[PDB]
Design a protein around this nucleic acid. Structure first.
Ligand SMILES: [Mg+2]
Length: 352
RNA sequence: AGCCAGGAUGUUGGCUUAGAAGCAGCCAUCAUUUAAAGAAAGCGUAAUAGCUCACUGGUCGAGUCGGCCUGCGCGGAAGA
RNA sequence: UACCCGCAGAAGAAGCACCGGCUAACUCCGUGCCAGCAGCCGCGGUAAUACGGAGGGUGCAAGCGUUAAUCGGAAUUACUG
RNA sequence: CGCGAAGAACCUUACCUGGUCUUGACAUCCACGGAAGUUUUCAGAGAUGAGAAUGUGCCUUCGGGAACCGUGAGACAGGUGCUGCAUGGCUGUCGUCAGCUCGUGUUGUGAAAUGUUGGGUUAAGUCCCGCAACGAGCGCAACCCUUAUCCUUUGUUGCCAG
RNA sequence: ACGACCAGGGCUACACACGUGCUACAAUGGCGCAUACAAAGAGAAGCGACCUCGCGAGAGCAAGCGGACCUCAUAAAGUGCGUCGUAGUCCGGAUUGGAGUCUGCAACUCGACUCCAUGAAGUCGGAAUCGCUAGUAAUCGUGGAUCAGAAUGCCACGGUG
RNA sequence: UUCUUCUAA
């Protein structure tokens, strides 16, 4: 009963936490009007507007009513815990044990529906990182950020896969494209595009003078064979490079952006990758613009476009600080092992 | 041939929707008061409903039906 | 009208800028090359008298700062020089 | 880079993986309860769980304390967590390199220069001479430890010529 | 809990790269026998004679000694005699098998050692590069620290030169 | 005889 009573408590604890994060009254005050608009039979005279109101009314309802059913079923747990203790029956005692568990899973999906309320979360994504303009500092600095997500998607458990591998000569790597793969990999990584800043005293410096570096991050969902727009082969620059003669360089001229594939000994599959690369890249270039037409450039990761300081990494002090949410940590290497996931949910539970 | 009547029981299969009901539909498609009537022919509904079919008997009082072999046709088949 | 008389009671009546040096006046805290500041030298890349806030202190005063503009300083067109 | 670490089978050990704990393993304070101590059992990988007899050393008109346990309450603990560009301490390095400086003095507007230079000389800013410098300090030398030889002393567990 | 404990693991992994070492590639050597030859330490839960057995590692007995007394503890190269006779060797010993000794709760990871078997590479090492100026280089042993056990390391010590 | 270059508190 000692885990069970905390399993009454800690379950009900996070229940009211989610009640704030919905702002389900802003759903419900809309809903209650939409309910009054529904039972108004004038909603049916435009039956298109009826389902646009009423199937939305159903969409407004059960998302709110989950949390209502969360508090209501937890009342029956402690009531059966009352009937567990004042009448010591081991069934009702274990009914306080067993039927308690069925509560959270109602919220556990819906909080997952609330956290991943973003639309193309369920797809996976690709990764696009260049070393910044720090210098030889930066090339290493990308290769650190290389393994950080490698260990992350190892730890989070996604299929890592090097689409493209470019290098800095003296230190680290210059730029990279990698296929991440699995459930909600764009669900995670959509909140982590852009600037990652190195600040440490430079061994590359002849003295130990404190220099600064940067790197890029860019995340775009795997949405080819899901998005209907086809790449025009004219802006699709046909260009060939080599394996690491079979590799295919694609330069999308009008938006000036590129994508590649390097590994396939068959040249077509380097291209067959790069079609999947670029069509996913064009749609993200559309959908970053599209959530910029939602209100403004606000419902994406605020203002990516090189204002993306969303995490910045300080090493001599060994502090790592988020910027799009602003959550901090000292366990710098754990984040380099992939405790960057705490920053992802920092974006998601803040609603970014 | 028409013509009179019905055209059914439910779990209106689940679905998942626009509400999904023989009839948008993924999908089973049963039992059922049976003269018969299908988890249905189509149309219709926003869906149901509405029309309506198969169907069944009532009426009708000679055949009826569409195959195949062919004979000759016919359309297709507009120019300075 | 000036001007005077009573009435009433502390009553109805103070703010703005500044404090790294230049230049009179400082600490605390937020903050970490960000946000910013700034006439100049120049500040802020975790301990900021230079940022922001606090308290404190300086400077004016029904004003106080900023900008604009002028000559001075500038002997920096040097008659003087 | 046979470095920390003069010596990781567990220990060490900080690490990894599970089992565990939250005034805590460790201090002090505080009350509360039992002398402390002593033996055993199972449960448990063990951390620990319930058993099992015991005890009264020390003082008192003595909570049973002073001894030691356990409980409560917290004040507090704890950190091999960060920072050797916040530090002390300590250490390498140039390098046992011969250099580094000061005082007053004079010189230059001054920064500075002078001496400390120059010449002979030394392993050495070592010495001498010259010397607007003259002095002083730290030094590079000497004092020290050992060995090289001799004398005296004492001669056992050391010595054996006679 | 960046705190406290416990077990097990790991710190010893392993395509690699480098430093520092050690041992060899032999005949000035190997082997065998015989034999001359130290210095400096350590020692009480320690050193442990002697004896016994164990091929050996050891065990058992068990003195002695806080040590100029006893023990660790014969130094080793050397020398003398023989042997190998220029070969992957009677060089050299890697590796591995089997059987043990021993430490310590306990030797899988992950100890040390004995014995038997095994007999790799290696036949003087690129460009380069290190040390050292006299008891030095060179090579010969020995002790100590640390330490249940566990040193080619380290710290010392004498031998030849 | 020949021989260069040293990111940005
Ligand atoms: Mg080397």
């Amino acid at each position: 009963i000692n885990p069970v009573n905390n399993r009454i408590q800690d379950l009900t604890e996070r229940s009211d936490v989610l009640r704030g994060y919905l702002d389900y009254d802003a759903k419900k005050e809309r809903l209650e009007e939409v309910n009054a608009e529904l039972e108004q039979p004038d909603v049916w005279n435009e039956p298109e507007r009826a389902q646009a109101l009423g199937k939305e009314r159903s969409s407004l309802e059960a998302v709110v009513d989950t949390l209502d059913q969360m508090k209501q079923g937890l009342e029956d747990v402690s009531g059966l815990l009352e009937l567990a203790v004042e009448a010591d029956d081991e069934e009702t005692f274990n009914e306080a044990v067993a039927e308690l568990d069925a509560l959270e899973e109602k919220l556990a999906q819906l909080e997952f529906r609330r956290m991943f309320s973003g639309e193309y979360d369920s797809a996976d994504c690709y990764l696009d990182i260049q070393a910044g303009s720090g210098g030889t500092e930066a090339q290493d600095w990308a290769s650190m950020l290389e393994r950080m997500y490698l260990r992350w998607a190892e730890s989070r458990g996604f299929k890592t896969e090097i689409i493209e591998e470019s290098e800095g000569e003296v230190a680290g790597i210059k730029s990279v494209t990698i296929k991440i793969s699995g459930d909600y990999a764009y669900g995670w990584l959509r909140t982590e595009t852009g600037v990652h800043r190195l600040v440490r005293k430079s061994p590359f410096d002849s003295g130990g003078r404190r220099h600064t570096s940067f790197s890029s991050a860019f995340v775009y969902p795997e949405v080819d064979d899901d998005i209907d727009i086809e790449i025009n082969p004219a802006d699709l620059r046909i260009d060939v490079y080599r394996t690491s003669e079979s590799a295919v360089r694609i330069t999308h001229i009008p938006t000036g952006i590129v994508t590649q594939c390097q590994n396939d000994r068959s040249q077509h599959k380097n291209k067959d990758q790069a079609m999947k690369q670029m069509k996913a890249k064009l749609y993200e270039l559309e959908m970053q613009k599209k959530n910029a037409e939602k209100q403004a450039m606000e419902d994406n990761k605020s203002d990516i476009g090189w204002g993306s300081q969303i995490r910045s990494y300080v090493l001599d002090d060994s502090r790592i600080k988020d910027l799009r949410t602003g959550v901090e940590t000292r366990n710098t290497q754990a984040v380099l092992d992939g405790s960057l996931d705490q920053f992802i949910e920092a974006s998601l539970k803040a609603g970014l």
